[PDB]
Amino acid sequence: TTYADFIASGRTGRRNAI
Amino acid sequence: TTYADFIASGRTGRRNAI
Amino acid sequence: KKGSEQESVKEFLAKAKEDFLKKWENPAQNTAHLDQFERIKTLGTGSFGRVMLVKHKETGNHFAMKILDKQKVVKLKQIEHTLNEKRILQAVNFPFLVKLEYSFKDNSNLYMVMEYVPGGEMFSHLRRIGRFSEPHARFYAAQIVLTFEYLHSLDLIYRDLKPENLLIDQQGYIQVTDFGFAKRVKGRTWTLCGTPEYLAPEIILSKGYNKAVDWWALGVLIYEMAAGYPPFFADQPIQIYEKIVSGKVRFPSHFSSDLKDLLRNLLQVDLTKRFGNLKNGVNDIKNHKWFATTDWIAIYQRKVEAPFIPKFDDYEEEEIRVSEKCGKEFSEF
Amino acid sequence: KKGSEQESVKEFLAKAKEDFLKKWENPAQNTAHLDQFERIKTLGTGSFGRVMLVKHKETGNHFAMKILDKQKVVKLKQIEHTLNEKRILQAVNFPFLVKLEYSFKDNSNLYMVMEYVPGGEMFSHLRRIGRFSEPHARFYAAQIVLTFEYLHSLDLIYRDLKPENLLIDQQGYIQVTDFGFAKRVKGRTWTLCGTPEYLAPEIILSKGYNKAVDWWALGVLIYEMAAGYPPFFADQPIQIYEKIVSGKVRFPSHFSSDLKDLLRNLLQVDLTKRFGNLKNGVNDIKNHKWFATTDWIAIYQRKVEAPFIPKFDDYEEEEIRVSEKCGKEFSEF
């Protein structure tokens, strides 16, 4: 888990609800 | 269309392919 | 002191609960009316409708007006959610909840006018600044703690805490917004909701849940505020769930020891063991070492200097169309 | 001059095509071997495998090693895509394509060793810096133009241009990476692919397409490079498609006039009318007013000073497991 892997995911923007 | 609306979407991170 | 604090909160929470039950049951209906506000500019938009910056003709105050188009809400099946938020919102009253100043409806639309919070959401400052320091994060945590403490005593469970719904105000304080998931529930609930990365292991495991869901959410927050990114994430919710379900976090090394310990008591898979759930509830959180330096009454009073304080083509205007329309459905508004 | 340039490119493209056909047909197989590189550190990861920073024991050069785990590729059905990228990549040769220095395989894995590009992708600089100025953007556009011009003469169509696959090098130049969509196609193709926001109106309308898809992609790029965000977007691809399909862009006011005009000739829904597709092809792009100041040979030569030049807990290491394994499937590698 880690910075490099998170800023590579698509999930860095506002996340929605379900 | 516009900055305010784009930085509100979920699409500001790396986008994937289909 | 301490005892004396306890004393106070007690008393407070009690009086608070009395006011809340009153409103809860004997509401608030058609407060203002369109014409009494001048239209300054579109702040943002979206399904449901667009959110406007308005100024109250007499009073000269600025509000943020959420305009929900009845028809759209009905189509997207958001009637129940819309009416319950209006309800909760006009009942509640706390230093850190954004305020529902006026509400009204017309042929066409539903209007919710809250207090305008210029600083924006924490989310964006967060991703830009990067990480918040243990102390900056602690200030924000302190505020959420209290809110949850209050919210819960009204049997309400916020069900969607995440940096995106916490806006920063003129004095640097937080304001919790958007309650379209809150529920008054004396017990266990079962609906599946919130944001992936903040979801409690129980919600996804479909067992019914309760207030404890928001204390596990608190843990993700302080974690993402202090780390930069969330303890569980993956591109593809499924994936995420999986990880949340194992309940195996990796704290960054710059964490404190003390912050790890609190985190580990919040990021608890076992409700039995989760901080916030035990006999003492909040107390277990407020007495943690990580918070030793915190003056809670001080914070309830906005008396502490905050660490941060927030300070492109514009929109393409349009026109409150207002032209009964869905009238059966929104009768309770 | 001009004529003389034309002269040159002609000649060049021709010789180029001769080398490409040769490789295309008579490939390149097992170049190096694991043991000959020392393992420095994980640069990133992902399905398929993890991407490592290695240094070539003799040569002392640094490479970026992509390790594909045969089994995983097979499961995610990416055999054909993996073999075609290896193929294209070892055939091509251009100042702005990242280089496939060595390739090999073993019991377990497939290895692709490219040239290490420390600056990272444009995507991130872009979102951080915000907008690129018409001139900064033009430098990058100039490079893509050329690449497309080359790529196309080899009947190849890149099918996924987007800031995310353009990495910035030590001298500020671009390097196009990741060719897992490229196709050698003398004609029209039909497969549906790429990223939502860059997709050409034709791809989604399922009519078969051709080289022109990459000239409409070029238009989105310069647009997102100069605006800050893409000409069509929405949270939910469906939505996006819809908009791309109407072909109704809103240029920001700070755009140039000249940039609007080029954009409007790239963001063309009508292939018949799209710049890049007409008899003259590239020429229509390179002669545009927006590019008047551009020295193309100068750019092909990296002779122009670039405007920008790029300059947290680390990973949790692991172990090339190497332990034939999928051997029929990857025979061509």
The CATH number assigned to the domain holding D55 equals 3.30.200.20
Same domain? For D134 and D14 the reply is: yes
Residue D208 CB contacts under 8 Å (≥ 6 apart), including other chains? D188, D189, D190, D202
Consult the annotation and say whether D118 binds a ligand.
yes
Amino acid found at D260: K
Whole-angstrom distance, CA of residue D216 vs CA of residue D197: 11
Q: Which two tokens stand for residue D50?
A: 């993890």
Same domain? For D286 and D201 the reply is: yes
Question: Using CB atoms within 10 A of its CB, is residue D47 exposed (0-12), middle (13-18) or buried (19+)?
Answer: exposed
Across the interface, whether the CB atoms of A2 and D235 are under 8 A apart is answered: no
Whole-angstrom distance, CA of residue C47 vs CA of residue C72: 7
Task: Please state the residue numbers annotated as binding site of C.
Answer: 43-51, 66, 115-121, 162-165
Same domain? For C284 and C322 the reply is: no
Strands D166-168 and D49-56: unpaired
Whole-angstrom distance, CA of residue D321 vs CA of residue C226: 35
Amino acid found at D325: K
By C-alpha distance, the chain D residue nearest A9 is D46
Q: Which of A1, A3, A15 sits opposite C164 (nearest CB)?
A: A15
Whole-angstrom distance, CA of residue C60 vs CA of residue C37: 9
> What's the angle, vertex CA C64, arms to CA C62 and CA C69, rounded to 5?
140
Are C304 and C171 in contact, with CB atoms under 8 Å apart? no
Same domain? For C239 and C107 the reply is: no
Whole-angstrom distance, CA of residue D212 vs CA of residue D92: 20
Closest CA to D144 of D86, D206, D224: D224
User: Residue D105: beta bridge partners?
Assistant: D110
Task: Provide the H-helix boundaries in C26-101.
Answer: 70-75, 79-89
Consult the annotation and say whether D180 binds a ligand.
no
Whole-angstrom distance, CA of residue C228 vs CA of residue C319: 40
Same domain? For C90 and C158 the reply is: no
Please write down the HEC assignment for all residues of chain D: CHHHHHHHHHHHHHHHHHHHHHHHHCCCCCCCCHHHEEEEEEEECCCCEEEEEEEECCCCCEEEEEEEEHHHHHHCCCHHHHHHHHHHHCCCCCCCECCEEEEEECCCEEEEEEECCCCCEHHHHHHHHCCCCHHHHHHHHHHHHHHHHHHHHCCEECCCCCHHHEEECCCCCEEECCCCCCEECCCCECCCCCCHHHCCHHHHCCCCECCHHHHHHHHHHHHHHHHCCCCCCCCCHHHHHHHHHHCCCCCCCCCCCHHHHHHHHHCCCCCCCCCCCCCCCHHHHHCCHHHCCCCHHHHHCCCCCCCCCCCCCCCCCCCCCCCCCCCCCCCCC
Same domain? For C18 and C157 the reply is: yes
By C-alpha distance, the chain B residue nearest D204 is B18
Same domain? For C116 and C14 the reply is: no
Whole-angstrom distance, CA of residue C105 vs CA of residue C111: 6
Tell me which of D106, D155, D160, D261 is the catalytic residue: D160
Whole-angstrom distance, CA of residue C229 vs CA of residue C235: 13
Whole-angstrom distance, CA of residue C295 vs CA of residue D116: 52
Whole-angstrom distance, CA of residue C109 vs CA of residue C193: 26
Same domain? For C63 and C91 the reply is: yes
Strands D174-176 and D166-168: antiparallel
Q: Which two tokens stand for residue C204?
A: 């996804």
Q: Cα C180 vs. chain centroid, distance in angstroms?
A: 10
Q: Cα D226 vs. chain centroid, distance in angstroms?
A: 19
Residue B18 CB contacts under 8 Å (≥ 6 apart), including other chains? D192, D193, D194, D195, D196, D237
- Whether C160 is catalytic is yes
* Interface subset of B 1-18, CB within 8 angstroms of C: 2-5, 7-8, 16
Same domain? For D176 and D298 the reply is: yes
Q: Cα D172 vs. chain centroid, distance in angstroms?
A: 16
Domain that holds residue D216: 4-26+121-311
Probe site for chain A from C233, C238, C267 (most A CB atoms < 10 A): C233
Q: Cα D189 vs. chain centroid, distance in angstroms?
A: 19
**For C289, which DSSP code?**
G
Question: Using CB atoms within 10 A of its CB, is residue B13 exposed (0-12), middle (13-18) or buried (19+)?
Answer: buried
Same domain? For C140 and C274 the reply is: yes
Structural domains of chain C, count? 2
Are D308 and D61 in contact, with CB atoms under 8 Å apart? no
Are C171 and C144 in contact, with CB atoms under 8 Å apart? no
Probe site for chain A from C167, C229, C263 (most A CB atoms < 10 A): C229
Helices D134-153 and D2-25 pack at an angle, to 10 degrees, of 50
Q: What Å distances lie between residue D327 and D51, D70, D107, CA to CA?
A: 22, 9, 8
Task: Please state the residue numbers annotated as binding site of C for ATP.
Answer: 43-51, 66, 115-121, 162-165
Consult the annotation and say whether D283 binds a ligand.
no
Whole-angstrom distance, CA of residue C96 vs CA of residue C112: 18
User: Residue D42: beta bridge partners?
Assistant: D52
CATH number of the domain within which D287 lies: 1.10.510.10
Tokens 């204390």 locate to: C215
Whole-angstrom distance, CA of residue C217 vs CA of residue C208: 16
| D325 φ/ψ sector (left φ>0, alpha ψ -120 to 50, else beta) | left
Residue C143 CB contacts under 8 Å (≥ 6 apart), including other chains? C96, C173, C174, C299
C120 to chain A, closest Cα gap in Å: 13
Whole-angstrom distance, CA of residue C68 vs CA of residue C82: 9
* D312 in contact with chain C, both atoms CB, cutoff 8 A: yes
* Residues of chain D contacting residue C127, judged by C-beta atoms under 8 Å apart: none
Collapsed DSSP state (helix, strand, coil) of residue C109: strand
Are D102 and D39 in contact, with CB atoms under 8 Å apart? no
Q: Which two tokens stand for residue D120?
A: 């990272």
By C-alpha distance, the chain C residue nearest B3 is C312
* Residues of chain D contacting residue A8, judged by C-beta atoms under 8 Å apart: 44, 46
Cα-trace Rg, chain C? 20
Same domain? For C233 and C318 the reply is: no
Probe site for chain C from B2, B14, B18 (most C CB atoms < 10 A): B2
* Residues of chain A contacting residue C197, judged by C-beta atoms under 8 Å apart: 11, 15
Residue C279 CB contacts under 8 Å (≥ 6 apart), including other chains? none
Q: Which two tokens stand for residue C167?
A: 């806006």
By C-alpha distance, the chain D residue nearest C128 is D128
Same domain? For C12 and C46 the reply is: no
Tell me which of C69, C160, C169, C214 is the catalytic residue: C160
- Other Cβ atoms less than 10 A from the Cβ of C293: the count is 8
**For C264, which DSSP code?**
H
Consult the annotation and say whether D111 binds a ligand.
no
Amino acid found at D222: I
